[PDB]
Amino acid sequence: TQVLFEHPLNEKMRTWLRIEFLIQQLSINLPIADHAGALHFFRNISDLLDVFERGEVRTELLKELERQQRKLQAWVEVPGVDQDRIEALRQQLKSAGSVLISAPRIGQQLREDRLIALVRQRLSIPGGCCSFDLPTLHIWLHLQQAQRDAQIESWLASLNPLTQALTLVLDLIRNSAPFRKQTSLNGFYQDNGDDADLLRLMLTLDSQLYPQISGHKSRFAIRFMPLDSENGLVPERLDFELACC
Amino acid sequence: TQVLFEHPLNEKMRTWLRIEFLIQQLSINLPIADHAGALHFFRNISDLLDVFERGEVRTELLKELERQQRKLQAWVEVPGVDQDRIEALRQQLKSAGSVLISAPRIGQQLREDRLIALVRQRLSIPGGCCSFDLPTLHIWLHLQQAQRDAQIESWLASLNPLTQALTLVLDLIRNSAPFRKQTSLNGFYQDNGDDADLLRLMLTLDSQLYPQISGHKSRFAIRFMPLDSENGLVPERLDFELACC
């Protein structure tokens, strides 16, 4: 019955959410045995390289990892807390930091890759791929699965530093704040998110509504819209769950 | 061991080959249960609508269907031929013609669709989709599978007139000409394709080569390239299969 919507409260978080999604898509389609899986894969790599242009990802991740290490050392002197958890999270953060800092430039390996670049040029064209548009991709798919699997794995491994860091920080952020019940009157709602990075919002599918979140800096505004824009009525009162992370 | 490459000898055939591929991709991913399958689906619809701008698809298909009906009535007075096949193919062509001619404007239904248009706007953006970029798509995926399946089926049904016609003509074209053995000396080859619409070219994967087909009108030229552009050697003689359709 429940539906989770997340919203970034800054441009950094918007970037990070996109990267998360794209990297999840790359892990979900192995093994790659046809054009469908292949085009899907390369589209997501191409989009990922384009998302990287929105900010300095490595830089912001190195800062956030340490910041999370700082936000962890407040929880040290708190009875009831597992100190093995704290030390383990600290160690994960530290390792992610030094892996990330030592790693090559983010996805330079992916840009330089001849097969990736080749496919990347053709995605712009509407009927982008076919044996006649992409012969190199066509022959690649006639190889044995293990030759592709190995090529795929080295591509994904070069993203591991980023993946490890991002998985870490977003998980910590997502668990940094609890959900709280709120009410919208006549489909409208607004508040200062403070300097939270992420909104997390739960509705029911039985409401047959969806949120459209506006805002300028942090002061967010929500309009709860129906799916059917003729038949759909907005309730005069709606309760929902909200966490500001 | 064998690898089939096809090449269009005109802009019409290039269009048609792309449409074929895209429509195959739309049929291969049902049922749609997540963002991966959904984005894949909508990307292919969006690309299909863009391919339609390359020519008058309905028009060219109506002509080709009749032309195929004409090319069939030569085979009528040929002993050894099944006359049930001929009459059945004729009847399939005729039906495809009148279905296509009676159908609405090709994929106008798809352009007008609110959900398609909505998603279409967001594909331009690098990290195109997430619950925050596409809330309407997010809620759509929380529905029960049958609500999506029904929506998908009506979308695919509106393409049936095109699909039926195109499947027909391309199959007939592909079988209009037999494969013949040819030889390339030092990775090069050239000939007049006449006014053939399609080249069909078979190589072996063990050759570890691929064709790059040039040309101006019909006079085609082929360079057989290695995959590895340093280690790769081109044989002084290469035999391959070729059909001009």
Q: How was it solved?
A: X-ray
Please state, in angstroms and rounded to a whole number, the distance separating the CA atoms of residues A121 and B128: 19
Nearest CA in chain B to A140: B227
Pairing of strands B180-185, A198-204: unpaired
Decide: B107 and B48 in contact? Cβ < 8 Å.
Answer: yes
Decide: A110 and A49 in contact? Cβ < 8 Å.
Answer: yes
A226 CA: distance to closest CA in chain B (Å): 10
Q: Which helix (H) or strand (E) is B117 found in, with range?
A: helix B114-122
- Is B7's CB within 8 Å of A132's CB? yes
**3-class DSSP string for chain A:** CEEEEEEECCHHHHHHHHHHHHHHHHHHCCCCCCHHHHHHHHHHHHHHHHHHHHCCHHHHHHHHHHHHHHHHCCCCCCCCCCHHHHHHHHHHHHHHHHHHHHCCCCCHHHHHCHHHHHHHHHCCCCCCCCCCCCHHHHHHCCCCHHHHHHHHHHHHHCCHHHHHHHHHHHHHHHCCCCCEEEEEECCEEEEECCCCCEEEEEEEHHHCEEEEEEECCCEEEEEEEECCCCCCCCCCEEEEEEEEC
Q: Which of A2, A15, A21 is most worth mutating to test chain B (most B CB atoms within 10 A of its CB)?
A: A21
Could you give the 3-state DSSP secondary structure of residue B176? Answer: coil
B33–chain A Cβ distance below 8 A for any pair: no
Q: Confirm or reject CATH 3.40.50.10490 for domain A11-177, answering yes or no.
A: no
B117–chain A Cβ distance below 8 A for any pair: no
Residue burial A133-161, b: 16+ Cβ < 10 Å; e: rest: bbbbbbbbbeeeeeebeeebeebeebbeb
- Main-chain phi, psi angles of A10, to 5 degrees: -155, 170
Closest residue by Cα to residue B122 from B107, B104, B137, B143: B137
- Is B132's CB within 8 Å of A5's CB? yes
Residues from chain A that touch B40, judged by Cβ atoms under 8 A, are: 36, 40
What length does chain B have?
245
Q: What are the residue ranges spanned by the domains of chain A? A: 1-10+178-245, 11-177
Give me the amino acid identity at A125. Answer: I
Residues from chain A that touch B19, judged by Cβ atoms under 8 A, are: 127
CB atoms under 10 Å from CB of A198, counted, come to: 23
Same fold, A1-10+178-245 and A11-177: no
Which among B28, B47, B211 has CB closest to A127?
B47
Decide: B194 and B244 in contact? Cβ < 8 Å.
Answer: yes
B130–chain A Cβ distance below 8 A for any pair: yes
Q: Which of A40, A132, A140 is most worth mutating to test chain B (most B CB atoms within 10 A of its CB)?
A: A132
Q: Which helix (H) or strand (E) is B60 found in, with range?
A: helix B57-72
- Is A136's CB within 8 Å of B210's CB? yes
Helices B160-174, B11-28: inter-axial angle, 10-degree rounding: 120
A111–chain B Cβ distance below 8 A for any pair: no
Burial of B86 (0-12, 13-18, 19+ CB in 10 A): middle
Classified by CATH at the fold level, domain A1-10+178-245 comes out as YacF-like (2.60.440)
Residues from chain A that touch B127, judged by Cβ atoms under 8 A, are: 14-15, 17-19, 21-22, 47, 50-51
Q: Residue window 165-204, chain A: list those with CB within 8 Å of chain B.
A: none
Decide: B116 and B45 in contact? Cβ < 8 Å.
Answer: yes
Please state, in angstroms and rounded to a whole number, the distance separating the CA atoms of residues B133 and B119: 9
- Is A51's CB within 8 Å of B6's CB? no
Please state, in angstroms and rounded to a whole number, the distance separating the CA atoms of residues A166 and A187: 34
- Residue with the two structure tokens 């956030």: A64
Distances (CA, A) of B98 to B94, B157, B170: 6, 16, 18
Q: What is the side-by-side order of every strand in the sheet holding B219-226?
A: B2-8, B198-204, B237-244, B180-185, B188-192, B219-226, B209-215
Nearest CA in chain B to A23: B127
Please state, in angstroms and rounded to a whole number, the distance separating the CA atoms of residues A147 and A165: 29
- Residue with the two structure tokens 């409260």: A9
Nearest CA in chain B to A115: B227
- Main-chain phi, psi angles of A84, to 5 degrees: -70, -40
Decide: A22 and A47 in contact? Cβ < 8 Å.
Answer: yes
- Is A131's CB within 8 Å of B213's CB? no
Number of DSSP helices (H) and strands (E) in chain B, helices first: 9, 7
Which among A7, A54, A131 has CB closest to B6?
A131
Q: Which of A23, A131, A197 is most worth mutating to test chain B (most B CB atoms within 10 A of its CB)?
A: A131
Please state, in angstroms and rounded to a whole number, the distance separating the CA atoms of residues B109 and B114: 10
Please state, in angstroms and rounded to a whole number, the distance separating the CA atoms of residues A29 and B235: 37
Could you give the 3-state DSSP secondary structure of residue B243? Answer: strand
Closest residue by Cα to residue A31 from A142, A115, A149: A149
Q: Is the dihedral of CA B93, B94, B99, B102 positive or negative?
A: positive
CB atoms under 10 Å from CB of A108, counted, come to: 12
Q: Which residues pair with B222 in a beta bridge?
A: B189, B213
A118–chain B Cβ distance below 8 A for any pair: no
Which among A5, A15, A114 has CB closest to B131?
A5
Q: Euclidean distance between the first and final Cα of chain A, in Å?
A: 23
Which among A14, A40, A50 has CB closest to B40?
A40
- Is A139's CB within 8 Å of B205's CB? yes
> Rounded to 5 degrees, what angle do the CA atoms B174, B175, B180 make?
90
Nearest CA in chain B to A25: B36
Please state, in angstroms and rounded to a whole number, the distance separating the CA atoms of residues A48 and A117: 13
- Residue with the two structure tokens 């798509």: B137
* Resolution of this structure in Å: 2.8
- Is A143's CB within 8 Å of B21's CB? no
Q: Quick one: DSSP state of residue B76?
A: S
Residues from chain A that touch B135, judged by Cβ atoms under 8 A, are: 5, 210-212
B223–chain A Cβ distance below 8 A for any pair: no
